[PDB]
Each structure stands twice: as C-alpha cells, then as structure tokens.
C-alpha cells in the first residue's frame, strides 16, 4: 500500500515561483508524477508544470518549480477569495487539493528624502519595487499624494521595468496648502488592495539653531515613587556644542488621544552647562488636586513640553515627551512570541516578552514561572528569556503565569501574565509523538543549526521510521526540503542544518515521518518550530569617509565619499541636515521597517505547534496532501488572528 505525499503553501501567490515537494515513501520503481493547476472549478489547467519522476536512487524525492500565471481574475468592491485546484497524479492515483491564492505580487517601499516639508517645497520620493524575495521586479505602480482629508492631489502611473526597482519621483508643494499629515500611497498594478503608505508633515517652519532633548531617567512613573518625576534635560547646538538658555516645563496627562494639561505644574528652570536636571516634586503635583483616582490612574500616560529659549535671544525651541505611564509595575508581560500548543511530557520553551511600559525591552531582569520552585531565569537585553519548562505527561491543559523576580522592586510590582497550553491530540490518543528541539539564539547566516528529531513510541514501531522529511517555510514560501536518514534504535537524530542568507530574518521549520499504525491506518506525525535569524541585509552596504584625512568639515569644504558594497548594485543617495529630525523623524526609511511589514506578510499564525498535527501545517501556513487520505484542512481566511486585523 504505497503512500504518495505532496506539499505546497497554504496560499499561492500569482506571478511568483512557488515550489512543490514530491515524495513516495517505500514504493518500488521509478514513479512518475504530473501536477496540474486548474481553475476552481473546472479543467482550465492554469498550470501543469514539468514532468518529474521520483526514483529510489533519489529516495523518491523531486520538487516542482512553477509560477502561477494570471488571467485577470479577482473581484473589486466586496472582496471574495480566489482559489485553484491543484491536481497530482502518481501514475494512476490522483491526489487533489484546493488551495487559496493571493494576488499580491511583491512589495513596494516608499522613500522620501526627509520627513517634513514646508509650503513651496519639492517632495522627492523614490519607490522600491521588489518581488516576494526582495529582488528587483518591473510593474506599473500608481502614486497618489493624499492630504490629511484623504483626497489625491497628485496622481501618476509609471512602470518600473528596467528602472532597477527605483522610481525617482517628485511633487511640488503649493504655497496655499492644508497643513498636517500628508500621505504617499503606491501599489502594484496587479494588486491594489495591498496599499503601501508613508506620511509626511506639512507646516510653516524655519529650521532652528539648537536641539533640545527632554528625557526622564526611567521610562514610567511608579505610583508611589518618592523621588517624583526626574528628567535629564540635554540642550545642544547641532555641531556638538552646549547651549546657554532658559527652560519652561509644563506637565500633562494623555488618555488614548484625550490629553489633560496640568497648568499649576509649569516650572522655570536654569540651564547648567548645556544640561540640567528637573523634578516634578511630589510637593508640586499634589497642590490643587484634580480627578485623582489613585487606583484608576494606571493605564493612562503623561506628556511634558519644554519651551527652551537661548541666552542670546534668537531661537526658541519647544520640546516634548508624551506618553509617561503612572505604573505600579515597572514592566508588562506579553506572550506574543509564545506557542499555544505543546507536546506532553516534553520541554516547553517560552519566549515571553518582558516589555517596558512604552514598549522597550528590559535588561538584566530575573524572571520565573510561579510554581516550579526549582529555578528562576534572567532576561536578556531584549527583555526575553527562554523559559523552558518541563511538562508533566498528562492531558490536562497546561496553564502558565509568568512573573518577574527583579530585585530592588516591590513584590506587588512584579509583572505577570497568564496563558494556557493545549496538548497535541494523538490519533486515537495513541501518544506517539515527535519533538523538535533546537537552540534559540540569534542565528546569523553562516552559523550551523543542529536540528534534533525526538521520537516517542513503542519499540514495536521505532524500527520502521528510517528517515525524517524536513521543510523550511520562509517569507511565505517553501525554501528547502529533504530527508535525514534514520537507523532503527536512535530515538533522537540531529541534522546539522547550515544556515544561509535566505533564512533572514526568521523562518518556521516543519518536518514529519510516516508509518502504518493503529487500526491498519497510515499515520503521519509532524511538528513545527519558528526560528528567528539575525536581522540584517542579504548583502551589505557601508558608508565611511574616503579620505583618511580626518578633520572636521567646513562650510564649502570638499569631501571624498567612500561607498563599499556589493558589486553591480545601484546606490541612491541623499544628505539631510540632522537638525531636520528634531522637528520630525517618523516614516524615515529603515531596514527595520522593511522586515516589520515582511513578517506581517507571513501566513503562519502560531509561533510553534498546533492543536493537532493538522494544525501544525495550517498554523505554519502549509498544505500536505497524501495518497492515503491525510491532508490539511482548508484555509479560507487571509488573516490569522482570533481578533481579525
């Protein structure tokens, strides 16, 4: 009774290379396979890719490299999801599977020169056209400049063919114009529901002479903190020289977008060697109390504006820090990087996110799970520990509440968060399992990641499993798959998986084995793990001075510029006065903002495993279809979360 297995993504993107993996476990002879992609519904053969045969010489493995062609089919206004039927024919056996499809062709990245412009200025912006792999592609795009109202005040239609993914543009700003947050929307010709945006402020301004930094010592206000609100004021000229002036600081409270000013709080403070310290005295705040509600105040935030005036008289700067939370707890615990499903009797690895109240990670914080008196752990610079807890073998839902144990803090303060983890249901709850263990540390391209295959079952069957088949899903695509041979008796095997640049910034890895178990049934067990990879560029780009002539620049001084980078790569430049940023720094192009959208683009929904082995593939974003009858449930929603996006 030979078994034929086929695997492809949960979602099929159009105009892109997707791969389909073909295996034939323990079936004799060279076995031909023909796959065809059909309209749903009918025999339209959207795609039938190339002939492939899975030989025992190749251990019955080959893959299919194919790109879905488009035929201008979707729906505007209300959006209904499009599908295709994939059809696999192993000689005589046909295994069919209905797969979702997405229009999204790739990505588009909007660069403005700077963040903020004045009436009568030219907005210079480039747009960056890449495929699903961050490589150049050429399509027509439409660029709309939309004021705060939302109304397009300039529109264009341009192609990126042979422009190397860069569309230098501009738009001239009118003297009579609406001030506020203006937008730049762009989108590929093919896939308009996918909109890429950047905002930029338009206000009447003149660049100052000095920057002012108003920064509190600690990121929150502990409600009972005796010291009060302590703030370090840094004020300095742009070239690095310290300023002489006066400061005016008022305080205020911020509720969502609702803000409440504190007029009695305004204090005037001297300027001490271009630096200062300032306090909102416990004495100051309490006089003239307003809506105090001590217990209620937790969950809101505070804003503080300083207006700084030079000692010479020419320039006044208003600076502000907003969002200051009045806490009982220096921290907050979140479970956003934690799997919701575990293998019973096996280690459970938590990536708990210790968060400072604004959102920043917490450095050198001891943390542990309540119960399991055995051990406590320490947070990294990222506010994350790999709390690995031992499961008891038992089908009770595991419930975890994480608390911090940071010394020098009140025990009431310590941050907490609770989750619940559910057992992987086994087929007839036969309790034959697979466990993947791999060390969670920032992995860099070129490092080797040992992949540990943990097998749990009676001795009746263990000799049967003679290899494991592994799969790495990246950026929404199947990247690599293979087999690691196994000999009867090794319960645990490791694959020295060498990590390449494709893996950035992160990936999930699923894998599986197959056998013929209880009630004569062909059985497949699989497991999945999300692996994060050192965030960086695929290639590399460095800017340094090209003149070993160190000196400090002069107005009108000549300079040589050194650019080191990958060969043949195109480089676009811009030089901005740092002083601009003091007034606005948002929507500045960063390698980070790249990756953050990218990860949003992922089809996987859970950091880990799932309710059962089907959920493994679905939660990972994968379709498995086998000749035996086992295949993934159907995916009809584009977004994951329990609360939709």
């Amino acid at each position: 009774s030979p078994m034929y297995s086929i695997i492809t993504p949960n979602i099929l993107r159009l105009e892109s290379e997707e791969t389909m993996v073909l295996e034939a476990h323990d079936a004799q002879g060279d076995v031909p396979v023909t796959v065809t992609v059909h309209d749903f519904p009918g025999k339209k053969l959207v795609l039938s890719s190339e002939k492939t045969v899975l030989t025992p010489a190749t251990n019955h493995m080959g893959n299919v490299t194919f790109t879905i062609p488009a035929n201008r089919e979707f729906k505007s206004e209300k959006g209904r999801n499009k599908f295709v039927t994939v059809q696999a024919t192993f000689g005589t056996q046909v295994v069919e599977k209905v797969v979702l499809v997405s229009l999204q062709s790739g990505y588009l990245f909007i660069q403005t020169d700077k963040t903020i412009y004045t009436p009568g200025s030219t907005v210079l912006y480039r747009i960056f056209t890449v495929n699903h792999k961050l490589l150049p592609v050429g399509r027509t795009v439409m660029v709309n400049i939309e004021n705060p109202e939302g109304i397009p005040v300039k529109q264009d239609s341009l192609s990126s063919q042979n422009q190397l993914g860069v569309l230098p543009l501009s738009w001239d700003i009118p003297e009579l114009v609406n001030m506020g947050q203006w937008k730049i929307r762009a989108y590929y010709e093919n896939s308009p529901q996918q909109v890429f945006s950047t905002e930029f402020e338009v206000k009447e301004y003149v660049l100052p002479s000095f920057e002012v930094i108003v920064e509190p010592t600690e990121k929150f206000y502990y409600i009972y903190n005796e010291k009060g609100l302590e703030v370090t004021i840094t004020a300095r000229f742009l070239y690095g020289k310290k300023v002489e002036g006066t400061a005016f600081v008022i305080f205020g409270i911020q509720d969502g977008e609702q803000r409440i000013s504190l007029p009695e709080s305004l204090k005037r403070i001297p300027i001490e060697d271009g630096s200062g310290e300032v306090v909102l005295s416990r004495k100051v705040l309490l006089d003239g109390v307003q809506n105090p509600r001590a217990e209620d105040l937790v969950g809101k935030s505070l804003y503080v504006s300083a207006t700084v005036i030079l000692h010479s008289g020419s320039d006044m700067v208003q600076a502000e820090r907003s969002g200051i939370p009045i806490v009982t707890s220096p921290y907050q615990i979140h479970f956003t990087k934690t799997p919701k499903y575990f293998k019973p009797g096996m280690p459970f690895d938590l990536m708990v996110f210790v968060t400072n109240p604004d959102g920043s990670p917490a450095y050198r914080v001891p943390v542990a799970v309540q119960g399991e008196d055995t051990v406590q752990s320490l947070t990294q610079g990222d506010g994350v520990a790999k709390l690995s807890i031992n499961t008891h073998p038992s089908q009770k839902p595991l419930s975890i509440t994480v608390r911090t144990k940071k010394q020098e803090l009140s025990e009431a303060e310590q941050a907490t968060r609770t989750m619940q983890a559910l057992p992987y249901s086994t087929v007839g709850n036969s309790n034959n399992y697979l466990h993947l263990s791999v060390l969670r540390t920032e992995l860099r391209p070129g490092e080797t990641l040992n992949v540990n295959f943990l097998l749990r079952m009676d001795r009746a069957h263990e000799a049967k499993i003679r290899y494991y088949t592994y799969l790495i899903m990246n950026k929404g695509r199947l990247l690599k798959a293979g087999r690691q041979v196994r000999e009867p008796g090794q319960d645990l095997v490791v694959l020295p998986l060498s990590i390449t640049t494709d893996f950035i910034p992160s990936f999930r890895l699923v894998a599986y084995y197959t056998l013929i178990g209880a009630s004569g049934q062909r059985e497949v067990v699989a497991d999945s793990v999300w692996v994060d990879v050192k965030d960086s560029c695929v290639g590399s780009l460095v800017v340094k001075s090209g003149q070993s002539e160190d000196r400090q620049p002069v107005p009108g001084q000549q300079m040589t510029l050194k650019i080191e980078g990958d060969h043949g790569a195109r480089v676009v430049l811009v030089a901005v006065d740092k002083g601009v940023f003091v007034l606005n720094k948002k929507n500045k192009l960063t390698q980070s903002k790249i990756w953050d959208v990218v990860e949003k683009a992922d089809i996987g929904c859970t950091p880990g495993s799932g309710k059962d082995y089907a959920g493994v593939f679905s939660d990972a974003g994968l379709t498995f279809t086998s000749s035996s009858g086992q295949q993934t449930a159907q995916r009809a929603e584009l977004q994951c979360p329990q609360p939709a996006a």
Partner: protein, 504 residues
C-alpha cells in the same frame, strides 16, 4: 458561441499612450559633417495617439549660436480606429454619458464590428465581470459611427475607460484606454429628518438654465415605443438656438417617416444625411432648434423601433444646451420601467455599488442533484447557508425587501448570528417578479461573506448573481407524491451537510 470568427477581447492591445506633449529631448551632434552638416538619425517609437505630431527644435551651438527650425510633421493613422470623447469634470456617484466614435477610412469596404464597453469595478456599467456588453454594428466605408454609453463613476480621481472593438472576416482591432478626473459632491443633506439614525456605532473617540421633462411611452398598434420630451427656458427673454443630443436605447431607431414629418415642422431642422441615414446602425440623432421658449411647455414625440432583440437595454440619453454654451447643459436618461432612466445601484452615506448583474444563480437547469447542490455549497465562497421563513416584505421603487426569519444557523461564516433572529435581504426591483416569492414560506438560502450590506450590527443582505435561494414548504406541503423528488433531495442535502459538516 454563435460565430467563431473575431479577435478575442483578451487579445486586443488597446491604444494606451496619449500624452498631450512629449519628447523633451536633448541630443548632441557628434556626427562627422559632410557639407558642413553633421546629420543625426534618432530611431524612436510612435505613441498610441492618432494625430499629426508636430516637432519643434532649437540648435544651441556655442560657435554659431541658437537656431530655431522648420517644424516637422509626422502624419500618423490607421485605416480603421476609434477615438473616445469624454468630459473632464465628472462627479462621482452620478450617472453620466460618454460617446465613442469609430472612424472607417477604408474607401470601399463596409465593416461589421463587435465592440465591448470593458468592465470596471470603479464604474456602474451594464458590464458585469462575467456578463459582457458586446454591441454589433456595421460601418459604411469612409464613415464613422457614434456609440453612447451611460455609466456611473463609482469612485474618485483618475479613472481610465477602455473599449475594444473587433471586426469580422477582416484583420485589425483597436482599443481606447483614456483617463479623466472624477470628483465628489458632499451634500448628503436631502430632506433629512432631525434624527434618522443615519449615524454609525463605532465612529468617534443641475439644469439651471433648462426645464426638461422626458418620458418614453408605449405604442397602440418588432416593438415600437414613443419618445416624449417637454422643454422650456428660465429667463426674462426667450433664448437662442438650442441643441439636442439624443441617443438610442441599445438597438433602437426612430421612425424614418415621422422623423421626416417632424423636420418640416416649424422652428426645427435636421439636415438630410442625418435624416436619410440608414436603418442599419442609425443610433445617435442630433436635432437643432431655432429658439426655445421661456413661457410654456413645447414638447415633441416620435416613434422608436427595435432592430435587434436583447433582453437588457441601455437607457437612452437626451442632452440639451444653448448653441453657445455646452457646459451649462442638462442631461436626462430614459427607460420605460426605470424612472428617470437610471441604472440600479446600492447606496449608503457616500458609497454605492452597482446592482445590475443576474438576479440569482441561474435556475431550471436539467441538473438539480445533491452532487451539484453540495458542490456549490462546499465551495469556500459560501460564507453563510441559512433556512428562514419569509416574514415581512418592504416593496418599493428602488428595491424590494424580504424580511427573513433565521431559526437555525446551518453554517455561519464571518457572521455572528443568534438563534431566532430577523435579518434583511434585498432584491432589486428589476428582479422581483422573476423570483416568484411569497411570504410565510420557508426558504433555505446561501451566499458569501462579500454579499453583506452594511457594518455590524446595522447590516443587510444582498441577493446577487451567485446567490442561491430556494423556498422550503411545510411538513404538510411535502407529503404529496408529486413533491417527493424536491423534498427528497432537501432531506439528504441537510443530513449529509449536517452529519459530515463541511468536508473542510
């Protein structure tokens, strides 16, 4: 599938590039001179615009100086083509008219064209996704034909229009693809009552010169009807020559002799050729008037005939203006059952969508088995499948509303439906009678997540091209031996849907 001999719309490379100006070029004269003349030959590309291209140049040598040139003329055209004539300042969410002129400069060859106005979700047209809008026409050599097309700009900004015309037993096709500006109105203040529950739940932390009454009426004794117009001017003194542009409901033509009878008429004139034009594709008519009155109704009427049989008919259009001024015009559309001749669409606070596709998924097919029944129910598109009872009915001009009584949630989808709930399903007025629907009857129904009207919880339901509906009788109304076969497949559909659920 009648005739196999035309170029597929899918393979009709339209005309695309229509710059009002280009080639801002700057090129340098490196060539070895002969006669004291370097000669440059820049091989270029000819834009998809049919006009003579005037070329203006200036030679700035530092030694002799500047030099304007003799402009150069490159005469561009094709034997047969289109040009599309649009307005500029159109208004989103207001039904309008366009005219498409196909010219034929073949000297002796007539032509038969199948031309499609091409579908666009930004426009309420007659062209659904799947239901093409192809008009077939014939052209006398060295003559051009005017084709009207009334539409709704559903969205704002730079909207492009496309029309691809293909020919039979000959070679070329063409396509126009031309943008313009769409804009909004903003009033939404029509006879509002003080508190009409217009507001949502989750927000917050025009013919000024002309009287024009047009009504198309029917005839006593293929089919012929009456066109009626009734016009006036609003001012102190009577006005100058006024013009009428009149366009034919898809496949219509006036009564040639009554046309003649009217032209001898007082204060009126229509030249001979637009009056002795041929019955073959006589489609757009222009009538000029000596003057128009500010004092009372001076009407007119005449006959229209049906040249080709199609079930659905573009509204006719009638645009009137003073000879001097086009921009202060007044436009009316006619249709006998559609009041003021306007396409059916669906409207909320400032949004509308086009409700003009087939009423429901086509019925009466030979195949009514569980096999196909399930297939259209096992598709992923089906968000919801309900079985309710026609409880209440709001009938009206616009649409006809069927108040449905959900007792069981067979398969909820992206819907949060409670048990014993009353929900609003809509059906356009053009469809009402075709549905043969009566209250008090149970109905088992299904649709999509996309086919939900509104946002929660003040929502409604819409029956579209692919919505499936079917009445469900009582227990005392299925015991008949004749009605067995229906109620059989109802019982087996249900149970196997229920027990198995969906497959996936």
């Amino acid at each position: 599938n009648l005739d196999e001999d035309i170029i597929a719309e899918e393979n009709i490379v339209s005309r695309s590039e229509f710059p009002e100006s280009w080639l801002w070029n700057v090129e340098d004269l490196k060539e070895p001179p002969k006669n004291g003349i370097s000669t440059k030959l820049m091989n270029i590309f000819l834009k998809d615009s049919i006009t003579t291209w005037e070329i203006l140049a200036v030679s700035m040598s530092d030694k002799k100086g500047i030099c304007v040139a003799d402009p150069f003329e490159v005469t561009v055209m094709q034997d047969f083509f289109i040009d599309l004539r649009l307005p500029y300042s159109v208004v989103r969410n207001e039904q309008v008219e366009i005219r498409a002129v196909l010219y034929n400069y073949r000297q002796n060859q007539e032509l038969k064209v199948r031309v499609e106005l091409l579908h666009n979700p930004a426009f309420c047209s007659l062209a659904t996704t799947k239901r093409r809008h192809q008009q077939t026409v014939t052209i006398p050599p060295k003559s051009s034909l005017s084709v009207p097309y009334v539409i709704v700009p559903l969205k704002t900004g730079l909207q492009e229009v496309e029309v691809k015309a293909a020919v039979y037993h000959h070679f070329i096709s063409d396509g126009v693809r031309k943008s313009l500006k769409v804009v909004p109105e903003g009033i939404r203040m029509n006879k509002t009552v003080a508190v009409r529950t217009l507001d949502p739940e989750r927000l917050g932390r025009t013919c000024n010169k002309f009287d024009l009454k047009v009504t198309i009426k029917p005839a006593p004794e293929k089919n012929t009807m009456i066109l009626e117009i009734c016009t006036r001017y609003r001012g102190d003194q009577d006005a100058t020559m006024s013009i009428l542009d009149i366009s034919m409901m898809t496949g219509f033509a006036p009564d040639t002799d009554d046309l003649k009878q009217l032209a001898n008429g007082v204060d009126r004139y229509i030249s001979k050729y637009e009056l002795d034009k041929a019955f073959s594709d006589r489609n757009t008519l222009i009538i000029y008037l000596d003057k128009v009155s500010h004092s009372e109704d001076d009407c007119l009427a005449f006959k229209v005939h049906q040249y080709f049989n199609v079930e659905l008919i573009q509204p006719g259009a009638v645009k009137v203006y003073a000879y001097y001024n086009l921009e202060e015009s007044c436009t009316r559309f006619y249709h006998p059952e559609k009041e003021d001749g306007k396409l059916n669409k669906l409207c909320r606070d400032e949004l509308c969508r086009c409700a003009e596709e087939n009423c429901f998924i086509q019925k009466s097919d030979d195949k009514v088995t569980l096999e196909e029944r399930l297939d259209k129910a096992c598709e992923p598109g089906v968000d919801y499948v309900y079985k309710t009872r026609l409880v209440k009915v709001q009938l009206s001009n616009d649409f006809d509303e069927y108040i449905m009584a959900i007792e069981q949630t067979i398969k909820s989808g992206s819907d949060e439906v409670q048990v014993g709930q009353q929900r609003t399903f809509i059906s356009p007025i053009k469809c009402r009678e075709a549905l043969k629907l009566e209250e008090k009857k149970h109905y088992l129904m299904w649709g999509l997540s996309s086919d939900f009207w509104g946002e929660k919880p003040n929502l409604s339901y819409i029956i579209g091209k692919d919505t499936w509906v079917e009445h469900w009788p009582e227990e005392d109304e299925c015991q008949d031996e004749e009605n067995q076969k229906q109620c059989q497949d109802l019982g087996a559909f249900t149970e196997s849907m229920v027990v198995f659920g969906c497959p996936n």
